[PDB]
């Protein structure tokens, strides 16, 4: 009621005043001395031409050689990027898929979509074929992004404003986080696999804590739903790409927005965001049929990766950084370098 | 310049590619109908003849149909609506008799205007199903439509009311050339509903076929 919203409001603008006071200068002023990275040239080293429909997501294996891509035709394909081979072809139960994952050990891959079920597939089996190991249910909304903490714990973000941390062995949620007021559409874990962040549809990104479950910090400043989020390799920062043709990088410790990556020519939204090995280059896959590599410290476009026929809906960078993969709404993948 | 294991792996990849191509060709013959509605419009009545998205499979006249009912996917519709871009047709069901109050014709109009005038479904022909004919007939026999339609100048008989509903809902659209909207009164207890759906699917299939040949 009135008094409750009253102290909520006074605490909120006290928080914003504290954030403003703790700010003295943006990093553009201090880092203007450093040189720009210069032009970046990208050549399509390989092309992967197996799918038949739209491509929604893919993940890079820890070996930085195998990647698994999910497409609307209900087929999970595990590629060998070095030779463009097809290690496996997994026929999904429900052809509607909106996310994919690859376990760090390489044993399991995860798939999920409009069925609100995050199924787990087992790769290395004595029988020689790929079969489901555990089908997780309990979500009242569509799955958005599921990621593997390790071989036994998987954290998934759904569309019912809830992010959940599952448990493969038992099969039920060990902890459920719920602070958002809109659909949660993307997920990303810190390099230490202790903290993770989620991008909701209410222009707010929250930082969670997997140990007990509670929102450590709330980050806002966008003007539309956030479609993808990704951690800085340092683990003390992250970048968000919303639907208003902007990409912003936040600081976990400072608890404040830092940079805005926007240009007049681009008006389409952002579908995926990922960094490089050193984090110098911020890659974002727009809907204008191409990506755009952004200099993460000078907020200047360092090049364009334009080779696709439809909207780019996914992106990924290997652990060693030797290659970057994109998958657009045409049934293609490209391994740039 | 490939070792034995590399050649065997390439052979396995080619076999997988052949299987994928065969399955994709088989699935290309499928017809995908997206089913929508107001919830209590009577989609159960439509789906009778044959925790998330429910897929219904049925075959008529040597043709396989794959109808999807979004149903309990109560979330931001615009975020997952694009997954259905490229469906053969869209079935919209609205209850004629549900004009009493809590008015629902206005909610159905809002849903229809939001769905038809969507950037994704620009060319996908929308089929409109009007059901509960007897209940609506009894209701108009009792009370007129001025409760829902203050700007009504017509007869207090079911045929003119149904015609008004049909022309209004057809006028709800904007792109009258790039999109085709069908209509049918589906309260008859026969197979006419599936025949009408088949005819609409045949028309749209001919339309897609005319694109590949370049005759457009």
């Amino acid at each position, epitope marked *: 009621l009135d008094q409750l919203r009253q102290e909520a409001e006074q605490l909120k603008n006290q928080i914003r005043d504290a954030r403003k006071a703790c700010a003295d200068a943006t990093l553009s002023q201090i880092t203007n001395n450093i040189d720009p990275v210069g032009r970046i040239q990208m050549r399509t080293r390989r092309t992967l031409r197996g799918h038949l429909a739209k491509i929604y997501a893919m993940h890079w294996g820890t070996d930085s050689r195998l990647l698994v891509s999910a497409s609307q035709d209900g087929k999970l394909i595990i590629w060998d990027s070095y030779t463009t081979n097809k290690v496996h072809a997994i026929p999904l139960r429900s052809s509607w898929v909106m996310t994919c994952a690859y376990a760090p050990s390489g044993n399991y891959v995860a798939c999920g979509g409009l069925d609100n079920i995050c199924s787990i597939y087992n790769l290395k089996t004595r029988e020689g074929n790929v079969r489901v190991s555990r089908e997780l249910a309990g979500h009242t909304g569509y799955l958005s992004c599921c990621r593997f903490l390790d071989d036994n714990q998987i954290v998934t973000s759904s569309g019912d404003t809830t992010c959940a941390l599952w448990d493969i062995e038992t099969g039920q949620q060990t902890t459920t986080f719920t602070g958002h007021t809109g659909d949660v559409m993307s997920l990303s874990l810190a390099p230490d696999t202790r903290l993770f962040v989620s991008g909701a549809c209410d222009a707010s990104a929250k930082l969670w804590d997997v140990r007990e479950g509670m929102c450590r910090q709330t980050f806002t400043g966008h003007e539309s739903d956030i479609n993808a989020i990704c951690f800085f390799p340092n683990g003390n920062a992250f970048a968000t790409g919303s639907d208003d043709a902007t990409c912003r990088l936040f600081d976990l410790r400072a608890d404040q927005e830092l940079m805005t990556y926007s240009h007049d020519n681009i008006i389409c939204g952002i579908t995926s965001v990922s960094f490089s090995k050193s984090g110098r280059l911020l890659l974002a896959g727009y809907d204008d049929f191409n990506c755009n590599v952004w200099d993460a410290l000078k907020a200047d476009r360092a090049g364009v990766l334009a080779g696709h026929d439809n909207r780019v809906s996914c992106l990924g960078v290997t652990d060693d950084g030797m290659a970057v993969a994109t998958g657009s709404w045409d049934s293609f993948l490209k391994i740039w370098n | 310049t490939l070792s034995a*294991e590399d050649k065997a*792996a390439v052979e396995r990849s080619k076999m997988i590619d052949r299987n994928l191509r065969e399955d994709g060709e088989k699935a290309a013959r499928e017809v995908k109908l997206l089913l929508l509605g107001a919830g209590e419009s009577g989609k159960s009545t439509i789906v009778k003849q044959m925790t998330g998205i429910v897929e219904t499979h049925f075959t008529f006249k040597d043709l396989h149909f794959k109808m999807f009912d979004v149903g309990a996917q109560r979330s931001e519709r615009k975020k997952w609506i694009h997954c259905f871009e490229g469906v053969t047709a869209i079935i919209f069901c609205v209850a004629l008799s549900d004009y009493d109050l809590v008015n629902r014709m206005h909610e159905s109009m809002k849903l229809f205007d939001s769905i038809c005038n969507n950037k994704w479904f620009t060319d996908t022909s929308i089929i409109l199903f009007l059901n509960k004919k007897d209940l609506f007939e009894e209701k108009i026999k009792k009370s007129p439509l001025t409760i829902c339609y203050p700007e009504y100048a017509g007869s207090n008989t079911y045929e003119e009311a149904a015609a008004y509903i049909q022309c209004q809902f057809e006028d709800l659209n904007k792109r009258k050339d790039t999109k085709e909207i069908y209509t049918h009164f589906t309260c008859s207890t026969d197979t006419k509903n599936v025949q009408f759906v088949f005819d609409a699917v045949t028309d749209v299939i001919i339309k897609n076929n005319l694109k590949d040949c370049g005759l457009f």
Partner: single-chain antibody, 233 residues
Framework: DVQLVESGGGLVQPGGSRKLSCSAS????????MHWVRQAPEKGLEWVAY????????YYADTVKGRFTISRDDPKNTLFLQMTSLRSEDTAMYYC??????????????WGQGTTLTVSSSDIVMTQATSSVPVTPGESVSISCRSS???????????LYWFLQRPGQSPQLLIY???NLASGVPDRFSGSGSGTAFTLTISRLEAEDVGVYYC?????????FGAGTKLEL
């Protein structure tokens, strides 16, 4: 679980046309590459034939090329081997090796039980040097295998396998591609080496490890097995 049973053995006069059949159950037989390995009684192993998945590739050993026929029956999960004009040297026990080829896969992971047959009266040469090395439990032993051609392919992976045959039954895979460990084997075994030089080291040996050891190549067909190093005590 995975099972491989073969039948068709016995006694036959030279020049016959006996057929050998192997049946499998417990795995997706349609996506596996089949092999055949024979063993003369007081000898080592040697390749016979091989048919890939889908029956698309069929090879043979030059010793029996043109006289032996390979064939698989996917719907019935059965593997057939047709023999014609048997010679007196063909007296050996035959196996039903399985293998599946993809990146990171481990071929020759399982070996069939084996059936015996008796008849009345450019390749890479592998030398295993010693043939019998007495060993004692609690020690660290090393087995050396040598090859003629360089086994390090351009891809960076050296194609060579190891095989242990305990006295009495079929052999089992130990190490594939000279460094990786087979599934289910204890951590005790470990292998390394270089081009044309290969050593398998068994630190802290105990029982259950007695038997013969076989080193095999896979770089080009035909495959050739080593003479064998035999352990006891």
């Amino acid at each position: 679980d995975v099972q491989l049973v073969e039948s068709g053995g016995g006694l036959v006069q030279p020049g016959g046309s006996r057929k050998l059949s192997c049946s499998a159950s417990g795995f997706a037989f349609s996506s596996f590459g089949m092999h055949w390995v024979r063993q003369a009684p007081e000898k080592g192993l040697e390749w016979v034939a091989y048919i890939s998945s889908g029956s698309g590739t069929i090879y043979y050993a030059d010793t029996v090329k043109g006289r032996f026929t390979i064939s698989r029956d996917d719907p019935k999960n059965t593997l057939f081997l047709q023999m014609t004009s048997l010679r007196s040297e063909d007296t050996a026990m035959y196996y039903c090796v399985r293998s599946i080829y993809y990146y990171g896969s481990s071929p020759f992971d399982f070996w069939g039980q084996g059936t015996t047959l008796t008849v009345s009266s450019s390749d890479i040469v592998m030398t295993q040097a010693t043939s019998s090395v007495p060993v004692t439990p609690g020690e660290s032993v090393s087995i050396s295998c040598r090859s003629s051609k360089s086994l390090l392919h351009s891809n960076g992976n050296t194609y060579l396998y190891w095989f242990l045959q305990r006295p009495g039954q079929s052999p089992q895979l130990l190490i594939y591609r000279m460094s990786n460990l087979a599934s289910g084997v204890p951590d005790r075994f470990s292998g390394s080496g270089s081009g044309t030089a290969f050593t398998l080291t068994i630190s802290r040996l105990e029982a259950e490890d007695v038997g013969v050891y076989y080193c095999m190549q896979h770089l080009e067909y035909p495959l050739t097995f080593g003479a064998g190093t035999k352990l006891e005590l």
